[PDB]
Symmetry: D2
Subunit: 280 residues, 4 copies
Amino acid sequence: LRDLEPGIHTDLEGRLTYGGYLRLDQLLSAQQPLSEPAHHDEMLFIIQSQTSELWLKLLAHELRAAIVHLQRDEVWQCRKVLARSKQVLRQLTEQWSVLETLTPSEYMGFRDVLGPSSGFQSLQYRYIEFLLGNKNPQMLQVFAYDPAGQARLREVLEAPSLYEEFLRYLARFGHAIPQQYQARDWTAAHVADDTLRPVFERIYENTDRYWREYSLCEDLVDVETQFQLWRFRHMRTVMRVIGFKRGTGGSSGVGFLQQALALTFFPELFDVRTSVGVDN
Amino acid sequence: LRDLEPGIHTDLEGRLTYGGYLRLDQLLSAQQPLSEPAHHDEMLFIIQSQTSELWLKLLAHELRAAIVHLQRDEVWQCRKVLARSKQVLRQLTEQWSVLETLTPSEYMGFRDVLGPSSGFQSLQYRYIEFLLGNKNPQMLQVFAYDPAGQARLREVLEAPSLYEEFLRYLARFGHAIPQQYQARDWTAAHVADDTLRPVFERIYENTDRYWREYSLCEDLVDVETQFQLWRFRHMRTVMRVIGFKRGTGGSSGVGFLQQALALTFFPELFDVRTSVGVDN
Amino acid sequence: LRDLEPGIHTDLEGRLTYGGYLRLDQLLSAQQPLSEPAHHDEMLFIIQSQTSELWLKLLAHELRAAIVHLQRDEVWQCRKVLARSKQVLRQLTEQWSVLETLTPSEYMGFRDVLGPSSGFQSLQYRYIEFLLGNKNPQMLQVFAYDPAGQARLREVLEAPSLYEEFLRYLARFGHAIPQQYQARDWTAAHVADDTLRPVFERIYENTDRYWREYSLCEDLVDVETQFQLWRFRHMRTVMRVIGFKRGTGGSSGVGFLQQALALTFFPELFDVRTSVGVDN
Amino acid sequence: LRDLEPGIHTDLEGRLTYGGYLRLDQLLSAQQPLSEPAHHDEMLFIIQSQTSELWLKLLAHELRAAIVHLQRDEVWQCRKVLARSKQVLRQLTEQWSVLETLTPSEYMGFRDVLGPSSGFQSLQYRYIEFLLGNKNPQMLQVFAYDPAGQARLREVLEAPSLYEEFLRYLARFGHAIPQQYQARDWTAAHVADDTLRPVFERIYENTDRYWREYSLCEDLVDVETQFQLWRFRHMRTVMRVIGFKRGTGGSSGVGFLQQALALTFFPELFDVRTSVGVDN
Ligand code: HEM
Ligand code: HEM
Ligand code: HEM
Ligand code: HEM
Ligand SMILES: N[C@@H](Cc1c[nH]c2ccccc12)C(=O)O
Ligand SMILES: N[C@@H](Cc1c[nH]c2ccccc12)C(=O)O
Ligand SMILES: N[C@@H](Cc1c[nH]c2ccccc12)C(=O)O
Ligand SMILES: N[C@@H](Cc1c[nH]c2ccccc12)C(=O)O
Ligand SMILES: N[C@@H](Cc1c[nH]c2ccccc12)C(=O)O
Ligand SMILES: N[C@@H](Cc1c[nH]c2ccccc12)C(=O)O
Ligand SMILES: N[C@@H](Cc1c[nH]c2ccccc12)C(=O)O
Ligand SMILES: N[C@@H](Cc1c[nH]c2ccccc12)C(=O)O
């Protein structure tokens, strides 16, 4: 019904190809279900996590770029990168709707083939957690089988987080940021700091003067909020698929995931809500 | 802040892990930007397409199973598979929002590295179009360089589409379906059949009796609508990124994509809308 | 640029119009901000809640219908009404994205005009909560100021919930549902009932035999999951707008909201996850 | 299961409540179906449109403010309001998924009660259309039945559009904007202007310098894209509900709707895609 237009290239036998550029032979032979006989639902299971890992790879790529922009006081560029980061997190969050068509009786058909394998062992996810600030050195051991993986995590562990680079940015523009944010043991997760309260009150209550800082505060709140949405949707999927069974990874499951939901990446941004006044 | 739970597996050196099961060494080495020097936005571009191909792979996997169910008159199972299929199409549609953060001035930084490559050359996409019924034998020449891919496409070309299998299902349950749907040249795309109008009127106007048929009709309409939504969002993205420039694949671009949006997979389901009356 | 077709009705002076049918004079005169002078953001605030209440009215309309279908063993009809209900709950959940563009310094500009008013006093919301099974007699008093509204809330409180009507449906079809669900004091919130475990294990482990029951089970899990997602997105919005301040309604705020996230509408459906085996 | 905290206001008899503040008595009595006997689906039908009109009211409120900010060179504030406007348009677009659960056989049960009423007679929709730049004087006669309404619509018809106010903003900042945009007959819909091409090339090819203009250009592209998506989803819904029947408003229906999809609010922004080079 749609005729092939003249001008469309067909002899590609020798030029850059779609499959070549996207390395599709490699990409599309990475799905290796283990059930015997084959279980229909295992393909969804694999694809669900693989798409997530691709989005996580991009998210890390963008977040690193956002940090470089902050380091250079390039605010509008940082915000544009963060807008893309938000969209990526939104896709990661939206796609839970697919896996929710998987029932407990379907999953029980192949859960056993997974052995001890678990998202808890996701290097990319932990890399992102660390970069946003949720640094737990306990996680380094989990990755002993992958010394190389452990080393990349150590690297992000030892660098200022996204949030810390934001405070360092604020410091450069006259805000009353404590001196320790210029240099400290970055491997220690940030502890909520009440001396930042007046700093953010001033930004939120004088948006005309501190529009750049204000817009970045709200971006960071967006980023945390969406990440918590991801955690919550994952957790609700776990509840409907395995309920309160222990996880393949060896944790108590839902309870363990709920403990992460109770964490906050950017404590002072949320804390300031209790004291902020009207803008003027 | 979250302490590691006791019981979490960490001696993983000789066991199946997340990364192993999902083949992440292979999956996450498949992104090879060609820009020199590196262009920041090329990683997004690659990931966007690769995630789409992964979803397309799953979509084909599910649609094949839905067809098997239809062949066996397993309606409730067919509907469940179709439900998942809709969610996959929904993800494919939703993710355009990420790519919409790519501006023309960013794209012009690396568009030339793509040469003649184009999603028009996507084997999985064409497989899905053929399976839903949009069979254009002209497309076989796009895949001449890929004997194995051409053969896989030929196979779906030569078998009844999802829609035709639905019509064969209706025939098994006494609906007035022409004999030709029992066996015909399947490689010829379905032509709208006015003798099917009375068939669908009867289903829509007697939903109590033909509830199974009615629900499947609406599933198919859902599937078509979501597919058209994907095409439309893709097309609008093309508009904002390259405007009315010709495509890398050699087509007129937007106009060529608009010609597909003008097509319908399940013509009689939509046609019947003009003549259906009240249910009773 | 688009000419009006001849044939379009333009003289409507004495005929039923769009605005007339939808009562738009009435609908669009119900937004009365109290701020003086008017605060720009107050319109968003009112509209966000009003759109939600309209969706809640429709949700109640649909769920009542689903219950009537259940009472009449009309399963396919019930599922179709539940599908629409799921879409409504999805809109209620998605729209939080609009209100998240409201910042703390913006809100503080008009929060004071609200007095004690709070969504805790949403009659329609509580109606839905009660209908789904979260019954709490302590709420009746909140609506003492509105005896008509209070009475309607008492009515749903006194009738079996959607879940209990599901259990009664199962009883009619041979499932081992305890005698108490035939008639009892419905004003008491349902308590997790261990004797229901065998009932749901059987359904999930023999989906071919019990496809109707299995599909309704998964519909209810869907509804509960989406409702929890609404609560969560509401709670996260509360966090970014007022943080941990006490609510206008007099509660501790986020803490009080978190307590409802711990409630479950359909406890046994989630409980069965721990014991359910492979289907066959 | 959740105890009321002490301190929650339960005696509201004389105080401002949720219902009172939001005028819910007025809002929730605005649903007046005409079917006899009542048709179950008419409620969905009314609510779908009414929620849309509430969002449209908000959208107008925000767009007027965006314009005022524009007139005053307040770019960051303009962009914040536009971001909210985008979210509102996204809700208007997402909610079509609810109405798609309406089947033709359901609709035929009450379509006749509507007479000639149609969304074509939506004053608020037309207001937004006019404000965004698609001005058509032919429309004024449609609201001759509503003199106050017709006049409000004529007012926006004569005022510079959002787009025209953006060009005027560009002219105040040294961009080569033709003299005609300082003053002209605004009732005429904006025609595509080739002399603007070099203006937009300059912006897109020098984003470091023109980051304000670049960001606004892309905001406008965002708004137009989302608006076209609403048109497309509406149109696809019309297709699945009435097919190619003539509309109640007297138009040819789908074909008339498609004609608007070919309209463009910001022609030069899309046009410049064909000539823009790499940014630098
Ligand atoms: C059937 C679906 C799923 C189930 C039942 C499930 C279950 C679990 C459980 C029980 C844990 C805790 C660790 C453990 O004991 O294994 C966990 C953690 C995790 N999962 Fe999943 N999961 C599912 C899907 C997914 C998917 C599709 C992804 C990736 C897209 C994912 C990514 C993660 C991540 C990153 C963690 C670590 C979270 C943290 O450390 O706070 N999970 N999951
Ligand atoms: C910057 C973003 C994109 C642009 C500018 C673009 C442009 C185009 C153009 C011009 C065509 C027509 C064929 C040609 O002349 O090359 C096309 C077709 C196609 N593209 Fe894209 N595209 C984009 C993103 C994507 C993505 C992310 C995918 C995901 C797989 C995709 C999949 C397809 C498919 C399947 C077709 C064939 C459609 C048909 O045959 O009707 N495109 N695209
Ligand atoms: C800035 C926006 C909002 C804030 C700060 C907020 C805050 C709160 C707080 C503090 C409570 C606890 C009761 C109290 O002490 O007042 C609550 C409950 C509630 N809110 Fe909101 N809310 C917001 C928006 C909304 C919207 C738009 C709706 C739309 C329906 C809504 C519906 C409800 C409902 C139904 C409850 C009762 C929940 C329960 O009983 O578990 N809220 N909200
Ligand atoms: C079953 C649902 C619907 C059907 C069958 C339908 C059908 C139509 C038709 C046939 C037209 C062309 C004018 C005419 O001849 O009447 C139209 C236009 C329009 N409709 Fe709908 N519609 C539906 C739902 C809605 C809803 C829920 C809204 C919410 C606002 C809406 C808003 C509009 C608007 C604003 C136009 C004017 C578009 C333009 O002038 O380009 N419609 N619709
Ligand atoms: N955070 C929202 C709203 C927003 C847009 N621009 C802003 C500037 C300042 C504060 C908030 C905003 C967003 O990024 O879309
Ligand atoms: N942790 C999951 C298993 C799992 C979920 N997603 C995965 C992805 C890959 C490997 C394993 C998983 C469970 O307890 O069942
Ligand atoms: N087509 C919609 C609505 C729907 C659900 N069940 C149905 C049965 C018959 C007709 C339509 C429906 C869906 O699949 O969600
Ligand atoms: N066809 C696109 C190029 C393109 C889009 N997506 C792709 C994925 C892979 C290779 C090329 C592409 C263009 O005309 O610009
Ligand atoms: N619960 C999901 C998946 C589903 C569809 N049909 C089913 C039948 C049985 C179990 C689950 C399903 C849905 O309603 O879309
Ligand atoms: N409870 C909210 C106030 C609120 C939110 N949404 C509302 C809707 C109507 C009236 C009041 C509200 C607070 O503590 O700030
Ligand atoms: N237009 C997209 C991407 C974007 C964000 N900031 C920008 C600044 C300039 C250009 C584009 C952008 C958005 O608003 O999310
Ligand atoms: N124009 C629609 C009728 C319609 C759709 N939405 C409406 C809202 C109000 C009044 C009428 C309508 C039709 O031709 O069937």
